[PDB]
Every structure is written in C-alpha cells, then in structure tokens.
Design a protein around this ligand. Structure first.
Ligand code: A1A87
Length: 167
C-alpha cells in the first residue's frame, strides 16, 4: 500500500492520472520523482522547468555541479540527484527530443531506467515539448517498465485521450 490517490490502473504495475506532477510530488513526497531532463540538465521548460521552479532553483544549482563534474548525460540515460522539497530523490531521465532529430527508438532505453526503482512518480517521457506522440510514449512505458509507475498527465484533454485509446 502507498499514498498515491485517484489513479486509474492500466496494468499490473502502471497507473495514470490527470495531474500536475509538481502538485502531486508536493502532496505525496514520493521516494522518486522522475524529471523529463535533457543531457545538460538545463531545466528550462516543460516538466523540468516546473520542477526546478518548485525547488526555488536548487535543482538547477545541484545539476550544474553534477554536469561540471561528470559531463552531459546520454540520450536514453539518467542520473539520481536530490528530490529537494518534492521527493527523496529525483531521477533525471533523458528521453529523445524529436524536435532535435533524436532517435525515437531511444525512448525504450529511457524508460528502462525506471526499472532500477521500485516505485516512481513520473511524466510521459518525450511527450509535451519533447515532441513525441504521448500515446506511443504510454505504450512504450507499459511495455518496458516493470516496477510500479504512477504517471501524471498535465493536460486533461490529453489524459482523456490516453485512457480512451489505451489497449
Ligand atoms: O504536456 C505533456 C507532459 C509531459 C512532458 C515532458 N516534457 C515536457 C516538456 C514540456 C512540456 C511538457 C512535457 N507535461 C506535464 N505532465 C505532467 N506534469 C507537468 N507539469 C508541468 C508540465 C507537465
């Protein structure tokens, strides 16, 4: 039993809800919140900009030190950093950004990072401003993640479409 509330169950391990991931994380304080990161951990917009803003820029400060030490992530890769006031940990995961020409096949690799954590709050990778079809992202999530994932979909109209079209 966990404290996630109001989710629709899609499969044995995947749940989905129309919610603002920032407000959800503040309420649940999950062990792991997933950020929709880029390789530079520059948290400008989308989910990343919103999470970082909610940390009063502490996420960005921590991220800049991470990059200065380690260099950029790989597309499809991840790193674990602090969750600040939102969660114990933040798993920064880089899905392909179609608006940069990146290979959508890397979306499965991106979701594989979730399997290193028993329970996660997460957005749909590569959706929104990353330019991929959210229906496809949800399919890859369900077919790749085996741990317990709670998906927050910000756009209510998109949430209804994802549920109604789910196979
Ligand atoms: O809109 C699709 C969806 C996934 C997404 C990944 N990256 C993005 C970059 C820009 C815009 C959107 C995205 N957005 C969100 N889903 C849940 N909570 C959210 N809080 C703030 C935004 C947001």
């Amino acid at each position: 039993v966990n404290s996630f509330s109001g989710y629709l169950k899609l499969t044995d391990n995947v749940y989905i809800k129309n919610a603002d991931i920032v407000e959800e994380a503040k309420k649940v304080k999950p062990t792991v919140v997933v950020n929709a990161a880029n390789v530079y951990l520059k948290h400008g917009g989308g989910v990343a900009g919103a999470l970082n803003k909610a940390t009063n820029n502490a996420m960005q400060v921590e991220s800049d030190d991470y990059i200065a030490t380690n260099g950029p992530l790989k597309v499809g890769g991840s790193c674990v950093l602090s969750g600040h006031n939102l969660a114990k940990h933040c798993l920064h995961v880089v899905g392909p950004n179609v608006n940069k020409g990146e290979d959508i096949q890397l979306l499965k690799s991106a979701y594989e990072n979730f399997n290193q954590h028993e329970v996660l709050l997460a957005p749909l990778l590569s959706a929104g401003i990353f330019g991929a079809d959210p229906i496809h992202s949800l399919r890859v999530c369900v077919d790749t993640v085996r741990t317990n994932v709670y998906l927050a979909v910000f756009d209510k109209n998109l949430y209804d479409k994802l549920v109604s079209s789910f196979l």
